[PDB]
Amino acid sequence: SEQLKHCNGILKELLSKKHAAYAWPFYKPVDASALGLHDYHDIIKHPMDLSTVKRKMENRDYRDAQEFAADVRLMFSNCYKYNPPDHDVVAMARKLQDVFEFRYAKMPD
Numbered sequence: 001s002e003q004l005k006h007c008n009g010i011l012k013e014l015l016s017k018k019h020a021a022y023a024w025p026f027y028k029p030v031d032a033s034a035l036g037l038h039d040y041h042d043i044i045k046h047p048m049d050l051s052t053v054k055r056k057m058e059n060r061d062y063r064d065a066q067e068f069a070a071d072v073r074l075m076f077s078n079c080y081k082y083n084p085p086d087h088d089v090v091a092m093a094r095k096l097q098d099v100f101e102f103r104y105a106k107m108p109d
């Protein structure tokens, strides 16, 4: 699938050194206990992160680009739901989503 190759390219870019200064909070699943966020899993019903997206891509879990996009956008939405809007991590999410949305928009079709 041409479109899933494009998705995989986006994924690689989101994980690349170019964006690491703001992407790193999204690299792994939120470890709420380790971070002291003992209300995280009461607020967030469907955790998501880039390592999970990568695993799903490697396992051929995604059947289309929209399913991939749904997971990436869910990851950002969780950040916007859990954190106050002026939190540093929300600023990082907005920057990484801008990277994602502009390249996702270039999807071959």
Ligand SMILES: Cc1nnn2c1-c1ccc(-c3ccc(N)nc3)cc1N(c1ccc(Cl)cc1)CC2
Pocket: 024, 025, 026, 030, 031, 035, 078, 079, 082, 083, 088, 089
């Ligand atoms: C994703 C996500 N969505 N909401 N949060 C996080 C998040 C996820 C992982 C980490 C993390 C911490 C340490 C570490 N070694 N690895 C990873 C930190 C997070 N937060 C967070 C706070 C502040 C700054 Cl500036 C950035 C990040 C706030 C909580």
